């Protein structure tokens, strides 16, 4: 169960930075759970395989690149030549994200979310997951540093060893 957090600036409220978490089981094709939050309230929704397949079919685009576009948009991993915009209608709880060209707005995806009744639980879970990831990354980095020091020492010794061997 992999998760990814991203920062999105909705067009409606540019001055506020919203957080969007997307969780998928094994691959992005199998459906995902999306939770949007702003620090006080959260909305959660789910997308299954059927919905993504139908959306891909409707667009008349090859399904091999629809998943790539969704990965580049929802997960916030994209180059400088592409820009995405997200809009969230509160009353209709409708969340759609699109790709913005030069005055050529193309729609990419649209979902519907439901207001959660335990915002504190969602925020606490997000913070706890972030802290756990930070700790694991720090431990892994320390281990890698130790291994690198060991390898450097071994190479430094073997240099002089080779010097002596060639001398003899």
């Amino acid at each position: 169960m992999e998760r990814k957090i991203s920062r999105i600036h909705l067009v409606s409220e540019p001055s506020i930075t919203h957080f969007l978490q997307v969780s998928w089981e094994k691959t992005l094709e199998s459906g995902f759970v999306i939770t949007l939050t702003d620090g006080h309230s959260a909305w959660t929704g789910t997308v299954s395989e059927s919905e993504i397949s139908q959306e891909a079919d409707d667009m008349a685009m090859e399904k091999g690149k629809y998943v790539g576009e969704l990965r580049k948009a929802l997960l916030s991993g994209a180059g400088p030549a592409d820009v995405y915009t997200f809009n969230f209608s509160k009353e209709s709880c409708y969340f759609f994200f699109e790709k913005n060209l030069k005055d050529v707005s193309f729609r990419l995806g649209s979902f519907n979310l439901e207001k959660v009744e335990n915002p504190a639980e969602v925020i606490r879970e997000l913070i706890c997951y972030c802290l756990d990831t930070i700790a694991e990354n720090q431990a892994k980095n320390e281990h890698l540093q130790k291994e690198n020091e060991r390898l450097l020492r071994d190479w430094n010794d073997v240099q002089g060893r080779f010097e002596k061997c060639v001398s003899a």
């Binding site: 667009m59 008349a60 193309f106």
Partner: protein, 100 residues
Amino acid sequence: VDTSVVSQRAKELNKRLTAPPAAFLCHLDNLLRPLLKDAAHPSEATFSCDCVADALILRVRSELSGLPFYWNFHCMLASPSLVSQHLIRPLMGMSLALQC
């Protein structure tokens, strides 16, 4: 075709768009001009032709920024005046110039 029908046909062909006619026509020109001006220039521009009833449906499919872009020319048989003014008189002009 004028600008009014461009938006309608764009809505019908490729949905979920929010672009004005000007940008659509600019994209169409940028796609078409390179091919017509010079050939043997791969530009991911699939062209197809069909006939239904005294009409010519010319379908062009392209990818802009990695997204589909479809357009259809619903050409109809030209009037005698246009055909003459565009092919007949110029041809005789060239023939006479070459004879001179």
